[PDB]
């Protein structure tokens, strides 16, 4: 089920890609190299070989946006300032897209008075009501965003501003 | 003099390449990943950025065949069993090809009674006489070979077996 030969990596100009059969992971350079986009047809549990990995030196596991357990390359292309490993990201979604943009109908604000890192949350409630104001303590903008066919999700650092409730849609995987 | 945007790296299947405008460095996989071919239109002194480098983790400087000072990627694709860093290689030749094959009219023998590593030598003397018998202490076959338009050279590990005259054409660069 895990074939290394399928895994490809290429970098040219301002664009880098770590890809395989079901994975597409794009890193770009503005000021500095950082994670830009990711597309998952199916989330896989294979480990990414450093032989097939760009910039695999001095990688901190905690900063790897995509966990190595889910096939995240051990790479600084798998980085993003203000964000850490998304172990609690919505990896249960199967088909999933990771990028940095605003979820529709939401706003994100950098505030040290915000809640700490927690399991990733969906921007809509169980009712379908859109949570408007979100925040993060030390993260950067545009915010870390997941997109499934069910709805829109935010990274672990992005928490709701007015929300303290025992009801919330939250991802279901811990890593 | 050093533009990073030119530099490319790609890996697919059994083949990996670190390249730029004048550099082409190919690594292949049989059993294990190791340096296969290299072509230099002109040797450049630029340092290779780890962002553009494949497999840049845990790299031992001594095992890098192409010195980082001459733009050898800090990578395990830049490795080759039985050979170490070619600091004293003929990098002055301008147009240059590094591969693993036998220089025409020569034989290479693995022998512990051989001379130790030294500056890279040309297979012809100043007379044009072809030095026939070569050896190495611990190197592997096929032997490390450089090709310029002037002649053919062997890796630092490969020394002449019996040649008393220092009329040797020899690289005098130190790194």
| Straight-line distance from the first to the last Cα atom of chain B, in angstroms, rounded to the nearest whole number | 21
Looking at beta carbons, which residues of chain A come within 8 Å of B56?
54-57
Report the C-alpha gap between B99 and B175 in whole angstroms: 21
Give dist(CA A169, CA A128) in Å, integer.
Answer: 10
What dihedral angle (degrees, nearest 10) is formed by the CA atoms of A35, A15, A104, A126? -50
Q: Which of B136, B159, B27, B15 has the alpha carbon at shortest distance from B82?
A: B136
Omega cis (within 30) before A112:
no
| Angstroms from A51 CA to nearest CA on chain B | 5
- The H or E element spanning position B99 is strand B96-100
In chain A, how many domains are there? 1
Q: For residue A17, give both structure tokens.
A: 């890609």
Q: Are B95 and B41 in contact (CB under 8 A)?
A: yes
Name the residue range of residue B175's domain: 1-175
Inter-residue contact B98 to B144 (CB < 8 Å)? yes
Check whether the bond before A142 is cis (ω within 30° of 0). yes
Q: Which of B9, B33, B76 sits opposite A54 (nearest CB)?
A: B9
Query: Which residues are within 8 A (CB) of B17 and not within 5 positions of it... i.e. 6 or more apart?
Result: B8, B9, B10, B11, B24, B25, B26, B27
Token pair for B145: 């070979």
Distance of CA B30 to the CA centre of its chain: 19
Q: Which method was it determined by?
A: X-ray
Least CB–CB distance from B51: residue in A5, A9, A33: A33
Cβ-based contacts of A50 with chain B (< 8 Å): 55, 57
CB contact under 8 A, B50 and A59: no
Helices (H) and strands (E) in chain B, counts: 0, 11
Q: For residues A33 and A31, what is the distance between their CA atoms, to the nearest angstrom?
A: 7
Secondary structure (3-state) at B52: helix
Q: How many angstroms away from the CA of B4 is the closest CA of chain A? A: 8
Chain B residues whose beta carbon lies within 8 Å of the beta carbon of residue A61:
none
Tokens for A102? Answer: 């605003």
Chain Cα centroid distance, residue B174: 15
How many contacts does A have with B, using Cβ atoms within 8 A? 66
The verdict on a CB contact (< 8 Å) between B55 and A50 is yes
- The conformation of residue B170, written as its DSSP 8-state character, comes to B
> Which residue does chain A place closest to B76, by CA atoms?
A51
Mutation target for B interface from A5, A21, A57, A64: give the one with most B CBs within 10 A. Answer: A57
Q: What is the resolution of this structure in A?
A: 2.7
C-beta separation of A12 from B6 below 8 A? no
Contact of B95 with B40, CB cutoff 8 Å:
yes
Rounded CA separation A70/A47 (Å): 7
B103 token code pair = 């220089």
| Rounded CA separation B36/B155 (Å) | 14
Which value, to the nearest 10 degrees, does the dihedral of the CA atoms of residues B119, B123, B125, B131 take?
Answer: 110
Residue B174 in contact with residue B85, Cβ under 8 Å? no
Q: Measured between beta carbons, which residues in chain A are less than 8 angstroms from residue B14?
A: 5
Which residue from B54, B79, B48 is spatially nearest to A9, judged by alpha carbons?
B54
**Which tokens is A168 given?**
């919330």
Q: B91 by DSSP, 3-state: which?
A: helix
Q: What are the Cα distances from residue A90, in Å, to A43, A94, B12, B45?
A: 10, 9, 30, 46
Verify whether the Cβ–Cβ distance B10 to A8 is below 8 Å. yes
Of A9, A14, A59, the CB nearest to B11: A9
DSSP chain A: ---GGG-EEEEETTEEEEE-SSEEEEEEEESEEEEEEEEESS---PPPPGGG-BS-TT--GGG-SS-GGGT--SSGGG--TT----TTS-GGGSSEEEEESPPTT-EEEE-TTS----S-BBSB-SS-PBP-EEEESS--SSPEEEE-SS-EEE-TTEEESS---S---B-----
Asked whether the beta carbons of B24 and B17 are under 8 A apart, the reply is yes
């Amino acid at each position: 089920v895990c074939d290394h030969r399928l895994m490809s990596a290429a970098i040219k100009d301002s664009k880098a890609v770590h890809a395989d059969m079901g994975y597409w992971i794009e890193s770009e350079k503005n000021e500095t190299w950082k994670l830009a986009r990711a597309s998952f047809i199916e989330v896989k549990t294979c480990i990414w070989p450093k032989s097939h990995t760009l910039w695999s030196n001095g990688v901190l596991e905690s900063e790897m946006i995509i966990p190595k357990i889910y096939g995240g390359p051990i790479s600084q292309h798998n980085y993003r300032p203000g964000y850490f490993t998304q172990t609690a990201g919505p990896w249960h979604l199967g088909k999933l897209e990771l990028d940095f943009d605003l979820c529709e109908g939401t706003t994100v604000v950098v505030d040290e008075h915000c809640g700490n890192r927690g399991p990733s949350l969906r921007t809509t409630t169980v009712t379908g009501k859109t949570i408007h104001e979100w925040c993060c303590r030390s993260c950067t903008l545009p915010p870390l965003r997941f997109k499934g066919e069910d709805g829109c999700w935010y990274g672990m650092e992005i928490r709701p501003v007015k929300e303290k409730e025992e009801n919330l849609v939250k991802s279901m995987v811990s890593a």
